Amino acid sequence: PARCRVCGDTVDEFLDLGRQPLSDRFLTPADTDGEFFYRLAVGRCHACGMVQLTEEVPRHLMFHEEYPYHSSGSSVMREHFAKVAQRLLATELTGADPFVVEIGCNDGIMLRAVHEAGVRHLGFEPSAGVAEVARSRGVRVRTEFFEKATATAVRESEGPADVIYAANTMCHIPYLESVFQGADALLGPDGVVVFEDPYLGDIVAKTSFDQIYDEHFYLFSAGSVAAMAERFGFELVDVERLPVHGGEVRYTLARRGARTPTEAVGRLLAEEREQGLDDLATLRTFAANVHTVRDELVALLTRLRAEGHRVVGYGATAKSATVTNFCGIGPDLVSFVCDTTPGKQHRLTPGKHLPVRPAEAFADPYPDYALLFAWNHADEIMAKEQEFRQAGGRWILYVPEVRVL
Amino acid sequence: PARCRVCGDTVDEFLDLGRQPLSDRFLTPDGEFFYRLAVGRCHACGMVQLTEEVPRHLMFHEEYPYHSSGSSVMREHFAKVAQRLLATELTGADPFVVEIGCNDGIMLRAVHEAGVRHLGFEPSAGVAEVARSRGVRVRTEFFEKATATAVRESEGPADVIYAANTMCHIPYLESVFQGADALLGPDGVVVFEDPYLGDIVAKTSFDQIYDEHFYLFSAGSVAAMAERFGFELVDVERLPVHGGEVRYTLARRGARTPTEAVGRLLAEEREQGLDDLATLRTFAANVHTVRDELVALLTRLRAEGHRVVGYGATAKSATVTNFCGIGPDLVSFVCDTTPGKQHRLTPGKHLPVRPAEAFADPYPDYALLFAWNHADEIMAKEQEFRQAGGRWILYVPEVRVL
Ligand SMILES: Cc1cn([C@H]2C[C@H](O)[C@@H](COP(=O)(O)OP(=O)(O)O[C@@H]3C[C@](C)(N)C(=O)[C@@H](C)O3)O2)c(=O)[nH]c1=O
Ligand SMILES: Cc1cn([C@H]2C[C@H](O)[C@@H](COP(=O)(O)OP(=O)(O)O[C@@H]3C[C@](C)(N)C(=O)[C@@H](C)O3)O2)c(=O)[nH]c1=O
Ligand SMILES: Nc1ncnc2c1ncn2[C@@H]1O[C@H](CSCC[C@H](N)C(=O)O)[C@@H](O)[C@H]1O
Ligand SMILES: Nc1ncnc2c1ncn2[C@@H]1O[C@H](CSCC[C@H](N)C(=O)O)[C@@H](O)[C@H]1O
Ligand SMILES: [Cl-]
Ligand SMILES: [Mg+2]
Ligand SMILES: [Mg+2]
Ligand SMILES: [Zn+2]
Ligand SMILES: [Zn+2]
């Protein structure tokens, strides 16, 4: 059976999402025959507790020059990261020439604020097209993967870092031991690694299975991160819940013994215990709920198609690949998906090949129903689409359950 | 005989913050108003409330120096509120939102831009003209039974009545909720967000207690006030703004099913013991502790010869300075970005208010952070101060130097 990527012990599988494409490999017609697939399934290490995918997707297939996710296409997320820059600038710098490092800086949504404040900084972004965005904003960015050797080389040329930050990146990286070897080389004396990622507790509580796909190798919790930190000579010393991306936790890891864990760490552990997050049974109940959501969503879409309604998807999310492929949802059930990201438009969604169109197509004419794939952005979207609702249009949500609004 | 402004039963006092000035009344350099600031808990309905009501025309007036749109974080916060209300509550052919206390109208402007019918109530003439300037329909009236009833009659039913940092400012809740009964749709709701009692107690954030904050709402006291007025607490949400708030959703009794969040927050109040006067006494004890340590610290520092400056001329700061006895001998002046407040003096204790630039002229040894709710923003801005060896004094949730 599978072996844990953190500790090497045995992983018990609890959800099999079947054959899946790369979530962010939007296709032209020419690409469909060559299309990569893998088996997506999730399990729990019985030793260390880390919840993780069973099949590692090679990193160069996911992250590469044409990687299509631009972080700065959301107002809520631009403002989130401006506040992140402030937090780090306020609490994690010392001395005359402090140094902020980000792993997975993308289009520079966070570091651009660090730069504008005059603080020395460096991002690692192996996806060149978004890295060019970051650079166009004044950000220093190496087009390379953060791992032990690259971090260690930066330590020599740039000196110690006050903080290494990563958002929606650390869970994308199976090779955590290399990353933390790199952090141990690169951080200064009072340095920390601060990372925020989709939280297992929220996923389980919301039945948000679409948070499970190729780029989410780990579904972190405080318990698993605490064990992982200790294994690599680090220590979980602070936790913070965040509402973005469906529910996340931001973890702060110091070298072991360097800092006093905050009371927040124990509080979140107790939440996990109240949730039963570390019982496989809870995880099995999750998997049954995932199956109910699939049946109810497919039955709803099938009925709306039978009635001759028009259904269109809203937001070509990476997440949505898990939904379409696990649920068997093709162009017969959802005619196209509207998305604001220019590089996603005029292409086909992974595996199930829904056409992606610009947002403007949503109004020409308005559909009867919009399937909200970008449900983590619901208020922004439902707010602005007033003409849709005035014409009687309805929203279909499937988190935390299938429902029509 | 302290009487509950919601149910009229007896209020038991648990904290006395002494003689205080009006919080937002900054002085040019004799006729200075003081009132007694103290807080108690109605033993019958649980509502925590000030023991003396400041007459409202003294507080809310033409030159009121808070514009909501002044802060980036509240601009951002209110954009999201607009999106929330528009997404969740303002459904139908021709939905109508009313706001109590719309101020300079940032929130309603997004409702106006979405093409939704609305009306702000804003009795401060000046902020009201700003809101109008942004396209917001505003009456320059206090929201109360009569004014709300007439809006019902010209404009028809409202889907939502919303209030931010305003409901806690209004003693006359019965009048407000009558207004809302006249004016709300069938499935309409009153949605309001205010500084949360549970956070105040948890953070010993006693500077949240001052003239404008007449009520310190909890889920429990809100549920009881709602039921008194024939409404029902059907939703709650915690918000990090202004030191910790909760947003309460009220519908008419039986109109909606309370969300699971209402019960969870009531549980957290059970766990915190928030409905026990003993817990409030403990809080009052901690406030006294905070004063001792802060005073003792500032005194040590100025004997040691160090220079101290305040950062942010907040409304809240007046409670701290006057309760703690903090005058210009302990803390030399206060920097602030509100032109409105600059080159005037602080209420009661009289620290002078000078613009942000004065902080760097030269930097002090210690900066006493009154605008503690904006710590990241402020501390991230002030890189040279830190680089120069500066230090920050905070007193929430406890006195300490970072
Ligand atoms: C607000 C808005 C968005 N949209 C569109 C824009 C995006 O294409 C998509 C949203 O993608 P959004 O939920 O942010 O991330 P995705 O699930 O892809 O997830 C990606 C991939 C990644 C790194 N692995 C990850 O973990 C999260 C961080 O990011 O929706 C509109 O059309 N109209 C809109 O008004
Ligand atoms: C960010 C920043 C602020 N500053 C300054 C700006 C303000 O004067 C003060 C902040 O006041 P701020 O915490 O918002 O509210 P106050 O307690 O006044 O409270 C007021 C009174 C009122 C309506 N009753 C209320 O409840 C809240 C909503 O608003 O500090 C800087 O100098 N530099 C900065 O970088
Ligand atoms: N080993 C590694 N080092 C640095 N970046 C990496 C990486 N592996 C993947 N990435 C980058 O991680 C990013 C995840 S996208 C998330 C971007 C941004 N921090 C946000 O929160 O929105 C991608 O741009 C991808 O190229
Ligand atoms: N009965 C009443 N009706 C409407 N507005 C009122 C009121 N009593 C006070 N106000 C106004 O309520 C506001 C409180 S200040 C808060 C303003 C804004 N809602 C915000 O959250 O930033 C002031 O503008 C004050 O003039
Ligand atoms: Cl399964
Ligand atoms: Mg230790
Ligand atoms: Mg539009
Ligand atoms: Zn393991
Ligand atoms: Zn009472």
XYZ file of C-alpha atoms in Angstrom, chain B:
402
model
C -31.335 52.842 41.151
C -29.544 52.219 37.771
C -32.202 51.160 35.253
C -31.931 48.943 32.184
C -32.508 50.991 29.024
C -33.894 47.864 27.296
C -36.228 46.269 29.954
C -36.185 48.716 32.877
C -35.025 46.230 35.515
C -32.085 46.923 37.781
C -28.552 47.162 36.418
C -25.675 45.932 38.586
C -22.526 48.010 38.142
C -19.248 46.078 37.769
C -16.738 48.650 36.514
C -16.223 52.293 37.317
C -13.965 54.180 34.864
C -14.457 57.487 36.604
C -14.761 61.032 35.336
C -14.342 61.158 31.540
C -14.565 63.699 28.690
C -16.450 63.205 25.405
C -14.176 60.881 23.353
C -14.285 62.650 19.976
C -14.276 66.265 21.356
C -10.712 67.438 20.759
C -9.912 70.866 22.221
C -8.228 74.014 20.892
C -6.076 75.578 23.597
C -12.039 75.837 29.822
C -15.688 74.675 29.592
C -14.758 70.963 29.513
C -17.504 68.381 29.958
C -16.943 65.382 32.167
C -19.455 62.623 32.964
C -19.235 59.509 35.087
C -18.289 56.466 32.913
C -19.351 53.121 34.391
C -20.724 49.848 33.085
C -23.189 47.311 34.478
C -25.282 44.317 33.602
C -29.059 44.206 33.759
C -29.618 41.256 36.093
C -32.880 40.440 34.236
C -32.096 40.582 30.460
C -28.278 40.494 30.725
C -27.644 43.608 28.675
C -24.327 45.205 29.500
C -24.565 48.982 29.255
C -23.176 52.331 30.435
C -24.782 53.691 33.628
C -25.059 57.301 32.277
C -26.290 58.290 28.792
C -24.420 61.183 27.138
C -26.965 63.470 25.410
C -26.653 62.535 21.735
C -26.453 65.994 20.149
C -23.218 66.506 22.080
C -21.843 63.346 20.426
C -23.258 63.256 16.883
C -23.166 66.611 15.129
C -21.996 68.570 12.020
C -18.155 68.405 12.543
C -18.130 64.727 13.675
C -14.523 63.830 12.886
C -15.069 60.088 11.902
C -15.613 59.424 8.212
C -15.935 55.639 7.680
C -14.079 55.918 4.316
C -10.991 57.327 6.078
C -9.529 53.884 6.843
C -8.369 51.480 4.086
C -9.313 48.505 6.179
C -12.861 49.705 6.669
C -13.135 50.696 2.975
C -12.192 47.110 2.257
C -14.398 45.738 5.001
C -17.438 47.665 3.766
C -16.907 46.658 0.178
C -17.218 43.054 1.415
C -20.297 43.885 3.503
C -21.991 45.361 0.455
C -21.143 42.186 -1.455
C -22.484 40.052 1.382
C -25.820 41.878 1.617
C -26.245 42.059 -2.176
C -25.429 38.312 -2.475
C -27.505 37.001 0.415
C -30.320 39.289 1.386
C -31.302 41.518 -1.482
C -33.110 39.198 -3.723
C -36.428 39.846 -5.430
C -37.704 42.081 -8.209
C -36.905 45.418 -6.607
C -35.142 44.893 -3.295
C -34.603 47.768 -0.809
C -31.846 48.106 1.818
C -31.932 50.690 4.581
C -28.821 51.614 6.576
C -28.703 53.148 10.016
C -25.606 55.281 10.446
C -24.339 55.197 6.890
C -21.897 58.022 7.648
C -20.073 59.013 4.405
C -21.767 56.149 2.655
C -18.983 53.810 1.501
C -21.040 50.727 2.099
C -24.170 52.000 0.368
C -22.258 53.272 -2.579
C -21.658 49.701 -3.714
C -25.348 48.987 -3.286
C -26.090 52.061 -5.448
C -23.634 50.852 -8.098
C -25.238 47.419 -8.198
C -28.536 49.180 -9.093
C -30.222 48.352 -5.820
C -32.683 50.705 -4.208
C -31.644 51.892 -0.759
C -31.732 54.766 1.772
C -29.154 55.796 4.395
C -30.102 57.504 7.650
C -27.315 59.836 8.699
C -28.123 62.765 11.042
C -24.549 64.199 10.858
C -25.039 66.795 8.042
C -21.492 66.646 6.733
C -20.822 62.945 6.303
C -24.373 62.810 4.863
C -23.442 65.248 2.018
C -20.391 63.118 1.277
C -22.643 60.072 0.903
C -24.979 62.005 -1.369
C -21.915 63.033 -3.412
C -21.293 59.328 -4.024
C -24.830 58.722 -5.274
C -26.230 57.446 -1.981
C -29.828 58.435 -1.150
C -29.705 59.738 2.435
C -32.158 61.252 4.951
C -30.500 63.518 7.491
C -32.627 62.029 10.295
C -32.210 59.705 13.255
C -33.637 56.275 12.547
C -36.518 55.803 15.038
C -40.041 54.452 14.948
C -41.609 57.505 13.284
C -38.988 58.226 10.640
C -38.783 54.549 9.731
C -42.593 54.300 9.529
C -42.732 57.149 6.990
C -39.974 55.653 4.855
C -42.142 52.505 4.789
C -44.965 54.683 3.475
C -43.023 56.492 0.707
C -40.568 53.732 -0.228
C -42.389 50.514 0.756
C -40.912 47.503 2.604
C -37.179 46.995 3.242
C -35.441 43.682 2.707
C -32.678 44.607 5.152
C -32.000 47.312 7.773
C -28.184 47.360 8.329
C -26.033 49.088 10.983
C -22.329 49.047 11.664
C -20.853 50.582 14.823
C -24.132 52.329 15.315
C -26.600 50.065 17.058
C -24.413 49.999 20.172
C -24.393 53.832 20.055
C -28.263 54.094 20.383
C -29.930 53.669 23.876
C -33.399 53.691 22.364
C -33.397 50.253 20.825
C -37.128 49.752 21.360
C -37.745 52.704 19.034
C -35.284 51.353 16.496
C -37.019 47.892 16.463
C -40.494 49.342 16.202
C -39.133 51.247 13.230
C -37.871 47.959 11.827
C -41.249 46.288 12.404
C -43.038 49.070 10.452
C -40.504 49.011 7.696
C -39.213 45.448 7.084
C -40.404 43.064 4.333
C -42.027 39.765 5.288
C -38.756 37.893 5.322
C -36.775 41.062 6.075
C -33.949 41.248 8.627
C -32.009 43.659 10.778
C -28.318 43.081 10.449
C -25.914 44.844 12.855
C -22.271 44.652 13.791
C -20.667 46.108 16.906
C -17.816 45.664 19.368
C -18.365 42.264 21.031
C -18.533 41.866 24.820
C -16.807 38.478 24.619
C -13.742 40.028 22.980
C -13.620 42.949 25.358
C -13.590 40.580 28.337
C -11.110 38.200 26.683
C -8.685 41.060 25.703
C -9.270 43.387 28.677
C -9.873 45.897 25.920
C -11.508 48.407 28.297
C -10.687 51.296 25.968
C -13.625 50.009 23.964
C -15.762 51.504 26.753
C -16.406 55.211 26.164
C -19.300 57.636 25.540
C -20.403 56.362 22.120
C -20.452 52.748 23.197
C -23.624 52.619 25.228
C -24.160 48.837 24.812
C -21.669 46.032 24.849
C -23.649 43.395 22.987
C -23.385 39.651 23.320
C -25.286 36.862 21.576
C -27.183 36.295 24.792
C -28.235 39.898 25.400
C -29.057 40.375 21.681
C -31.258 37.242 21.686
C -33.118 38.526 24.711
C -33.500 42.059 23.355
C -34.738 40.624 20.029
C -37.387 38.448 21.662
C -38.493 41.374 23.795
C -39.215 43.327 20.629
C -40.759 40.437 18.770
C -37.675 39.584 16.725
C -35.317 36.589 16.987
C -31.567 36.133 16.689
C -31.160 33.950 13.628
C -27.478 34.366 12.692
C -24.179 35.461 14.125
C -20.720 35.982 12.736
C -17.476 36.945 14.306
C -15.460 39.790 12.666
C -11.886 40.858 13.448
C -12.496 44.599 12.800
C -12.271 47.245 15.533
C -10.781 44.848 18.061
C -13.405 42.094 17.632
C -17.025 42.282 16.698
C -20.043 40.172 16.069
C -22.614 40.672 13.348
C -26.097 39.770 14.544
C -28.965 38.903 12.177
C -32.478 39.478 13.494
C -35.728 38.364 11.863
C -39.291 38.635 13.193
C -40.007 35.781 15.616
C -40.571 32.475 13.745
C -39.768 33.970 10.332
C -36.474 32.128 10.121
C -34.711 29.173 11.602
C -31.614 30.142 13.553
C -28.350 28.989 11.970
C -26.034 26.583 13.842
C -23.691 29.485 14.445
C -26.119 31.135 16.951
C -25.978 28.047 19.160
C -22.195 27.655 18.860
C -21.612 31.312 19.888
C -24.067 30.936 22.768
C -21.968 27.871 23.792
C -18.754 29.867 23.666
C -20.459 32.422 25.906
C -21.465 29.506 28.267
C -17.791 28.347 28.154
C -16.511 31.865 28.835
C -19.024 32.327 31.644
C -20.009 35.633 30.035
C -23.466 35.615 31.676
C -21.895 35.484 35.165
C -21.295 38.834 36.887
C -18.265 37.164 38.540
C -16.545 36.880 35.141
C -17.268 40.575 34.575
C -15.787 41.394 37.961
C -12.722 39.472 36.995
C -12.519 41.589 33.857
C -12.834 44.705 36.010
C -10.031 43.380 38.201
C -7.869 42.890 35.109
C -8.590 46.458 33.987
C -7.266 47.704 37.316
C -4.212 45.512 36.831
C -3.658 46.929 33.324
C -3.811 50.430 34.726
C -1.289 49.668 37.497
C 1.255 48.105 35.140
C 0.847 50.680 32.426
C 1.192 53.556 34.842
C 4.104 51.902 36.647
C 5.799 51.239 33.313
C 5.327 54.742 31.908
C 6.654 56.099 35.212
C 9.787 53.908 35.290
C 10.442 54.920 31.687
C 10.192 58.640 32.175
C 12.353 58.432 35.354
C 14.870 56.393 33.390
C 14.902 59.509 31.193
C 13.176 58.123 28.070
C 10.962 59.914 25.578
C 7.356 58.593 24.985
C 4.916 59.435 22.173
C 1.336 58.182 21.566
C 0.343 56.733 18.253
C -3.202 57.265 17.011
C -5.563 59.798 18.616
C -8.316 57.210 18.852
C -11.696 57.851 20.489
C -10.796 54.861 22.686
C -7.606 56.533 23.971
C -9.616 59.018 26.061
C -10.761 56.285 28.388
C -7.226 55.092 28.803
C -5.632 58.446 29.449
C -8.300 59.623 31.919
C -8.790 56.351 33.815
C -5.035 55.803 34.023
C -4.208 59.461 34.698
C -1.909 59.828 31.736
C -0.961 63.408 30.974
C 1.753 65.233 28.958
C 4.343 64.605 31.718
C 4.057 60.859 30.933
C 3.447 60.936 27.152
C 4.452 63.964 25.113
C 2.077 64.104 22.176
C 0.058 61.982 19.796
C 0.457 61.497 16.049
C -2.588 61.196 13.858
C -3.497 61.267 10.170
C -6.940 62.829 10.666
C -6.567 66.504 9.627
C -9.800 66.969 11.586
C -7.969 66.068 14.840
C -4.572 67.637 14.183
C -3.357 70.700 16.065
C -6.029 70.314 18.713
C -5.600 68.641 22.150
C -6.822 65.283 23.439
C -9.894 65.067 25.649
C -9.535 65.430 29.388
C -5.846 64.795 29.785
C -4.843 67.237 26.978
C -1.977 65.551 25.062
C -1.400 67.466 21.815
C -2.271 65.944 18.406
C 0.272 66.509 15.644
C 0.503 64.997 12.163
C 2.154 61.678 11.273
C 5.417 63.406 10.160
C 6.082 64.592 13.706
C 6.783 61.000 14.789
C 10.069 61.082 12.822
C 11.217 64.440 14.158
C 13.139 62.863 15.766
C 11.823 59.353 16.522
C 11.081 58.695 20.238
C 12.373 55.840 22.345
C 8.898 54.420 22.950
C 5.643 54.631 21.039
C 2.476 53.894 23.025
C 0.163 52.289 20.550
C -3.343 53.578 21.046
C -4.430 52.478 17.573
C -3.691 48.887 18.614
C -6.403 47.542 16.243
C -4.102 48.712 13.362
C -0.898 47.358 14.770
C 0.382 45.584 11.622
C -0.291 48.491 9.357
C 1.315 50.959 11.703
C 4.275 48.874 12.692
C 4.941 47.814 9.048
C 4.959 51.493 7.973
C 7.408 52.522 10.718
C 10.506 50.672 9.531
C 13.019 53.477 10.310
C 11.626 53.754 13.857
C 12.270 50.081 14.466
C 15.648 50.377 12.701
C 16.518 53.295 14.984
C 15.895 51.113 18.082
C 12.282 52.312 18.692
C 9.980 50.172 20.803
C 6.228 49.876 21.030
C 4.146 49.821 24.159
C 0.880 47.916 23.917
C -1.680 47.437 26.681
C -4.100 45.025 24.917
C -4.386 42.245 25.851
C -1.818 43.085 28.520
C 0.847 45.658 29.101
C 4.060 44.810 27.275
C 6.858 46.226 25.165
C 7.653 44.673 21.749
